[PDB]
Design a binder for this molecule. Structure first.
Ligand SMILES: *[C@@H]1O[C@H](CO)[C@@H](O)[C@H](O)[C@H]1NC(C)=O
Ligand SMILES: *[C@@H]1O[C@H](CO)[C@@H](O)[C@H](O)[C@H]1NC(C)=O
Ligand SMILES: *[C@@H]1O[C@H](CO)[C@@H](O)[C@H](O)[C@H]1NC(C)=O
Ligand SMILES: *[C@@H]1O[C@H](CO)[C@@H](O)[C@H](O)[C@H]1NC(C)=O
Lengths: 220, 209, 214, 209
């Protein structure tokens, strides 16, 4: 078992300290590594440290800026990160890497570091009314656009969960402003648009701002 | 014979719940007690009971300068290497007996204690070393072994190896790959002052005969 | 610094097929090459070490080969739990480097193309901005293209897109995409559409959206 | 030791101007010479160098009655099949290794030697066969294959097929579809003098000590 801690939002040029606690194996015997993964990218190694701390090595992207350390009495690995760039936004993982000798590998659950100058803001809420644009008989897409928030996790639904069947919520896009948006959609018969209430439910949990908003069909 | 009566703590050696890895073997010192070995050599438990410089049935007649009990787990096909003059990864890098060894090597299969359904990996042995181990030397280091010309700097890579490997023990293994618990009883039979003696009953002291 | 190229960037397959993926090093690394599997939001799991040795508790259907510069991972008879992203990593020297992992992302075949589009809402208009929602939905290939029609000009650079993951039962994606325009732009222009281009069909598809004209 | 001469003719195997087709693979016998395997293994260009039962550094310390060197061209993604226990049209119909193979497999990309701008079709492989090859069996036959019930009578037809197919090596092919030159080295020890050995190293002379 490995458990990383110390992530979250940071201002560019700032500092952070990651930590990782080890349980159920002899952590003190091994090299330990930091590896990262930027959102939607591949794996990238960051740094290694020897079993006793005597030797340390880094990727040239982070050398000088980051420091790796451990203490084996506390079964703990650390990464001091200084001069944080937007480039350093990633999940960071704590790992034992196999080379040429058989052994059990361990990777932690990973912790997310976000580096940007945006700040917490609520969901800009924008339901989509079909109004006989893009409809035919047994088909009409209801939709809901959500915008301009900085912490990632915004949750959405149709008709207070009663219209869950066939819902598509697309993964959030980071805009050039440094703020996120997503949209959420369901396909329903055009004749049914006057029957159900067609609320888009939206909840930005880090803002604690929840709002549920009506689609107004046939309106233009 | 001396007039002590407390029996030696062999139950604490043979019936311990966890044994050590063979690279990090346990040693217990046995002293100031009565050693009844018949509880060992009359047991049906043991797949090996090989004595060196002594015979098992004679042990209850003797006195011993000191006694050591050494304990570890190995494979069934490695029990061969726990004897004087042997060679192989265990004899060479984990546990060495002297050529002049006096003592007994005792082993039993423990596949019902030291194996787990997904594999048990708690037990390890040293795979690499610069030089062979001396008799009763122990090495618990975890420096990266340098197999070639370039320094490792405490990191695994090309020709740079972690020195220890695990025994993976599954209940389904063939018997040469099952775990064995090994006890080595080691002693000096030289007539130096002796605090361990067999269960012998002393007479009166008769003079001028 | 050793560069690793993973040759198929994405694969499509069905349960019971054999699969192969390949990794190619910029210098010889002997047998020093790990393989990992990763699933969305989880950590990577080691499958193969050295270049051929199967890791403890990994299924025997995975196998590795190579010693030098060219390496392969095979999955002998593919299963519902194997649809993941796969990475090679060299173990030879520092820095430790990874290949850009192969996706194995179709869970099972179906032919189905499917295309649709949606307008920039009046309940969105209150933003002082327009945001179109081009919206091709439940189609089996990922591959598609989007175009725009504002006052019959074709817009570019001013766009973004997003895709939901390959559906567990359907093996279909859905895509959304957005042109966005200021108040000074979206009232100045009056004719609007997306157009969706997709190689599963003989033609693009387009529908009239008419922001500030309906 | 006497000074090193009569080196084995590996340059005639590795640097031949043209290689065999894989169905008609060449075998060269190496005997009565000094074999420096580390001069092969330390050379650049090998995309594969894989040894079974041996290591290249240990081969310089070993002697053999013969070495066989087998050579051919295959597709870059077929090199996977030149190993113990493999299956597929190369391993099954063209060139089979035994499961108890002692030897090394060497391969390199030959796109600049073996592709042509018009496509190179001089290299062939066996597409169809009755049954799988035995280890180190060869089959240069051109008898029309029968998938149907009728005797094909040496004429191609509905499901009567010519058994050999060409590769079409174009310089613009993807790397898995490019030509690879393969050498397999098999090491043979008999009840006979070991005529192939690694080179014996010498110090200087030291007189008057
Ligand atoms: C036993 O031996 C000791 C000397 O070692 C002596 O003092 C003692 O009187 C003897 N008898 C008993 C019953 O202990
Ligand atoms: C270990 O415990 C069992 C059960 O009580 C017993 O039969 C055995 O003699 C003990 N072994 C030793 C060496 O005391
Ligand atoms: C090799 O040996 C011959 C005699 O066998 C000797 O003349 C020659 O000088 C030696 N070669 C070298 C380079 O020392
Ligand atoms: C093949 O030819 C090249 C160029 O002359 C040489 O470097 C290489 O060592 C040769 N290989 C063998 C096995 O002779």
């Amino acid at each position: 078992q490995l458990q990383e801690s110390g992530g979250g939002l940071v201002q560019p040029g700032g500092s952070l300290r990651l930590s990782c606690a080890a349980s159920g194996f002899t952590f003190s015997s091994y090299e330990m590594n930091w590896v990262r993964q930027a959102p939607g990218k591949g794996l990238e190694w960051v740094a290694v440290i020897s079993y006793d701390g005597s030797n340390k090595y880094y990727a040239d992207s982070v050398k000088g800026r980051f420091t790796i350390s451990r203490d084996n009495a506390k079964n703990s690995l650390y990464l001091q990160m200084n001069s944080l760039r937007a480039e350093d936004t990633a999940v960071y993982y704590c790992a034992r890497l196999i080379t040429m000798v058989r052994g059990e590998d361990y990777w932690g659950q990973g912790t997310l570091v976000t580096v940007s100058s945006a700040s917490t803001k609520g969901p800009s809420v924008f339901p989509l009314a079909p109004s006989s644009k893009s409809t035919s008989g047994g088909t009409a897409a209801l939709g809901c656009l959500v915008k301009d928030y900085f912490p990632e996790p915004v949750t959405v639904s149709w008709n207070s969960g009663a219209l869950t069947s066939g819902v598509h919520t697309f993964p959030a896009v980071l805009q050039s402003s440094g703020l996120y948006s997503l949209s959420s959609v369901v396909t329903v018969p055009s004749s049914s648009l006057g029957t159900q209430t067609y609320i888009c439910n939206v909840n930005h949990k880090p803002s604690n701002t929840k709002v549920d908003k009506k689609v107004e069909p046939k309106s233009c | 014979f001396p007039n002590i009566t407390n029996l030696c703590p062999f139950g604490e050696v043979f019936n311990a719940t966890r044994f050590a890895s063979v690279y990090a073997w346990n040693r217990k010192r046995i002293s100031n007690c009565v050693a009844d070995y018949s509880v060992l050599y009359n047991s049906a438990s043991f797949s090996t009971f090989k004595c060196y410089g002594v015979s098992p049935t004679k042990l209850n007649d003797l006195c011993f300068t000191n006694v050591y009990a050494d304990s570890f787990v190995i494979r069934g096909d490695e029990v061969r290497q726990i004897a004087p003059g042997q060679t192989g990864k265990i004899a060479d890098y984990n546990y060495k007996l002297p050529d002049d060894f006096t003592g007994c090597v005792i082993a039993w299969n423990s596949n019902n204690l030291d194996s787990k359904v997904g594999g048990n990996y708690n037990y390890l042995y040293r795979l690499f070393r610069k030089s062979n181990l001396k008799p009763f030397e122990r090495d618990i280091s975890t420096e990266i072994y340098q197999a070639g010309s370039t320094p490792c700097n405490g990191v695994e890579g090309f020709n740079c190896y972690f020195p220890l490997q695990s025994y993976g023990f599954q209940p389904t293994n063939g018997v040469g790959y099952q775990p064995y618990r090994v006890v080595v009883l080691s002693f000096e039979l030289l007539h130096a002052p002796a605090t361990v003696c067999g269960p012998k009953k002393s007479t009166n002291l008769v003079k001028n005969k | 610094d050793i560069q690793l190229t993973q040759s198929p960037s994405s694969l499509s397959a069905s349960v019971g097929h054999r699969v192969t993926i390949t990794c190619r090093a910029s210098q010889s690394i002997s047998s020093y090459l790990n393989w990992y599997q990763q699933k969305p939001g989880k950590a990577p799991k080691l499958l193969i070490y050295a270049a051929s040795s199967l890791q403890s508790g990994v299924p025997s259907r995975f196998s590795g080969s190579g010693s030098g510069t060219d390496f392969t991972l095979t999955i002998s008879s593919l299963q519902p739990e194997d649809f993941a992203t796969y990475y090679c990593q060299q173990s030879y020297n520092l820095p430790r480097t990874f290949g850009g992992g192969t996706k194995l992302e179709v869970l099972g075949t179906v032919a189905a193309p499917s295309v649709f589009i949606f307008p920039p809402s009046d309940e969105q208009l209150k933003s002082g901005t327009a945001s179109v929602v081009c919206l091709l939905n439940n189609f089996y290939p990922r591959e598609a293209k989007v175009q725009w029609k504002v006052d019959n000009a074709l817009q570019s650079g001013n766009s973004q897109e997003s895709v939901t993951e390959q559906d567990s039962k359907d093996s279909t994606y859905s895509l959304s995409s957005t042109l966005t325009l200021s108040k000074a732009d979206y009232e100045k222009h009056k004719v609007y559409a997306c157009e969706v281009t997709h190689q599963g069909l003989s033609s693009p598809v387009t529908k009239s959206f008419n922001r500030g004209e309906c």
